[PDB]
Amino acid sequence: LVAAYPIVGVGMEKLIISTNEHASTDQGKTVSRATTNSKTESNTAGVSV
Amino acid sequence: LVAAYPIVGVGMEKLIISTNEHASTDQGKTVSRATTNSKTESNTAGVSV
């Protein structure tokens, strides 16, 4: 009169989360050098009294 | 009376980890050249006493 019957069910112990990012670090240096050569030429006139 | 029965289990010897990074290197050079041409023109008056 009694039935053969299994009854189950689950239960939570812990829960772990884990994010999604993308970190990045960059680092640089620089070195430079320049030269310059130039030439000017000018004139002047005038009158006073 | 005794039962035919196998019993097993596993055991850890070593563990190896391996990371994930994306390294990068860059190297550059540069060359440049420029010219300049100009012209000015000025005037002057004045009075003294």
Report how this structure was experimentally obtained: cryo-EM
- The CB-side HSE value for A39 (13 A sphere, CA atoms) comes to 0
Contacts of A38 (CB under 8 A, 6+ apart): B36
Structure tokens belonging to residue B27: 């190297």
Complete DSSP assignment for B1-49: -------------------------------------------------
Q: Which of B34, B48, B32 is nearest to A48 (CA)?
A: B48
Breaks in chain B (C to N over 2.5 Å), named by the residue before each, are none
For residues A29 and B25, what is the distance between their CA atoms, to the nearest angstrom?
Answer: 12
Q: Residue A38 has what DSSP assignment?
A: -
Resolution (A): 3.7
SS percent in chain B: helix, strand, coil, step 5: 0, 0, 100
